[PDB]
Amino acid sequence: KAPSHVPFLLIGGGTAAFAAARSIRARDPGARVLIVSEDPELPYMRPPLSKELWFSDDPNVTKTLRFKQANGKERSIYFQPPSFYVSAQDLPHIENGGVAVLTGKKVVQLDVRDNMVKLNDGSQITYEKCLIATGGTPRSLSAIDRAGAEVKSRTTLFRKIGDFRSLEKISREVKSITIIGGGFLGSELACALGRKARALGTEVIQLFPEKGNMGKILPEYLSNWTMEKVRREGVKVMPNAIVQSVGVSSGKLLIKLKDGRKVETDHIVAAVGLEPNVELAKTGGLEIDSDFGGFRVNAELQARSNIWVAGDAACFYDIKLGRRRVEHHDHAVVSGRLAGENMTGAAKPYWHQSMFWSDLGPDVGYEAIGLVDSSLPTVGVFAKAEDYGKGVIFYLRDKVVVGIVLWNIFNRMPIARKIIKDGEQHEDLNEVAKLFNIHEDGSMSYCRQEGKDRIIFVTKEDHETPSSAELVA
Ligand SMILES: Cc1cc2nc3c(=O)[nH]c(=O)nc-3n(C[C@H](O)[C@H](O)[C@H](O)COP(=O)(O)OP(=O)(O)OC[C@H]3O[C@@H](n4cnc5c(N)ncnc54)[C@H](O)[C@@H]3O)c2cc1C
């Protein structure tokens, strides 16, 4: 039972909303914050759904939804125990405030002038400050939408706890699973499913239009190296694949590609991008970004007076890097926190950069920051003992580093932040790479230029010489 009025209203019960709620409470100890969540589940982190929860030793991981971190500490996907929240009944009156989550309730109408929303059940809530943190909904393929009810019921869109539970069940009861999508989600699920299938010898297929996995973010040579790694996890990878039609044939899904090839499979998992949830822009009169999608907000994540946007749904202005829309866990954290600080009057711009990460089997793990885009010219520095095992990849624009990928090297994000912040025009990025110490614990080094991409292979002796890189202090 929601209150008629609440000081802080958070639309969406995901990662960005929770971070904003924690941030608001940290700056305003008496704050009373209401999260309106369409989802019946309380706020939870999503990255475990495509990684750690598939690799748990526990047979009941599907019910406990607990996973063990790299440090060995078991954790819950939920951000907080249910007890840490207060009920919506008590939110207006409980001493020193708190955070309540109204679950199973969708905001369907937004009035920015009168600072009011309406829920799917007719309730109306007025607010003083409002955060839109609606995230996005998985996109679908046109060929899937034309295939009818049978195919659509055998096609999974992966995002929620429920999606993990249903796919985990299917993985134990079918013989072939086909993943459509080459990005981080399609690739992470392929490695997880591929690893589950090694025991029973079942089939796992991944197909996508690009030349290789992660083709939109990684340079072509590293995308190819990565594809071979995914293939080595027991996955049949089909690059250069454009789905022309899908149908059911003799109890089995049959995918037809423009190439002419054909795939027969028992279940499809479609990981082909995200659609920002901008339905409230119509009633609210809020602007949507035509180039990036999502609500257009400024550097402070503000859309209009008393209304902010954070997370996957927010197209914001980065003072250093330009207008962006970022769909990553740590961004939802950073943006939700920034929005909460600004809802309490901080008026701070996006400055501390968000990062992201992925793991594609045991041989591929990276962190990244900034404009990681494979269309940009790049300089990649890899350790020489072609093996792309450990290294750092710089993404350039106007001779300036605007994005960095840390390839199988960890705890280097501090250095990567400084490089992005300073914005220097470096004459030799091999000198900058020395700061990352990619050989921690005798032939000559060499380099190669493959179109827009430079590839430097550096030995320990050369890499651990003094660096002339310019750092701003
Ligand atoms: C399986 C998976 C694995 C991932 N792995 C990684 C990873 O390894 N690294 C990484 O950096 N990122 C990863 N991500 C991305 C990261 O999880 C997302 O960027 C993050 O969840 C975005 O949080 P959010 O708050 O912006 O949106 P969401 O988490 O989508 O939260 C939005 C919530 O609001 C609800 N909602 C929508 N509209 C309304 C409305 N009108 N009223 C009320 N509620 C509404 C939605 O139902 C949803 O519950 C992964 C995502 C998924 C799905």
Residue numbers in the entry: 127 to 511, 558 to 613, 999 to 1030
Q: Could you share sentences copied from the article?
A:
The mitochondrial disulfide relay is mediated within the mitochondrial intermembrane space (IMS) by the CHCHD4/MIA40 chaperone, itself a member of the CHCH family. Among more complex eukaryotes, however, the CHCHD4 N-terminus lacks this mitochondria-targeting membrane tether and instead forms an NAD(H)-regulated complex with IMM-anchored oxidoreductase Apoptosis-Inducing Factor (AIF). NADH is known to allosterically stimulate AIF dimerization and release a 50-residue disordered loop from AIF’s surface by reducing and forming a stable charge-transfer complex (CTC) with AIF’s FAD cofactor. Here we find that CHCHD4’s scaffolding of dimeric AIF unveils a dedicated, NAD(H)-regulated import platform within the IMS that anchors and orients CHCHD4 to encounter incoming substrates, while also unshielding the CHCHD4 active site to stimulate disulfide chaperone activity.
To generate a stable complex for crystallization, we engineered a custom construct linking CHCHD4’s N-terminal interaction domain (N45) to the dimer-permissive AIF (104-613) W196A mutant which maintains an open C-loop. The AIF-CHCHD4 chimera crystallizes in conditions resembling the original AIF-W196A mutant, allowing the structure to be solved by molecular replacement. The structure reveals the expected conserved AIF dimer. The CHCHD4 N-terminal domain is resolved for both AIF monomers, allowing the first 30 (Molecule 1) and 20 (Molecule 2) residues, respectively, to be modeled into the electron density. The structure reveals that the dissociation of AIF’s C-loop exposes a unique binding surface, allowing CHCHD4 to form a hydrophobic scaffold around AIF’s C-terminal domain. The CHCHD4 N-terminus assumes a unique β-hairpin/helix motif when complexed with AIF with a buried solvent accessible surface area of 1440 Å. The first twenty residues form a β-hairpin, which pairs with the core β-sheet of AIF’s C-terminal domain in a parallel orientation. The interface with AIF is mediated by hydrophobic side chains of β-hairpin residues I12, I13, F14, and V15 which complement the exposed hydrophobic edge of AIF’s C-terminal domain. The helical turn is anchored by a histidine (H20) which inserts into a hydrophobic pocket formed by AIF residues I610, V507, V564, and A604 and makes a water-mediated contact with N602. C-loop boundary residues F508 and Y560 contribute to AIF’s hydrophobic binding surface, forming an aromatic tetrad with Y347 and W351 as previously observed in crystal structures of the activated AIF dimer.
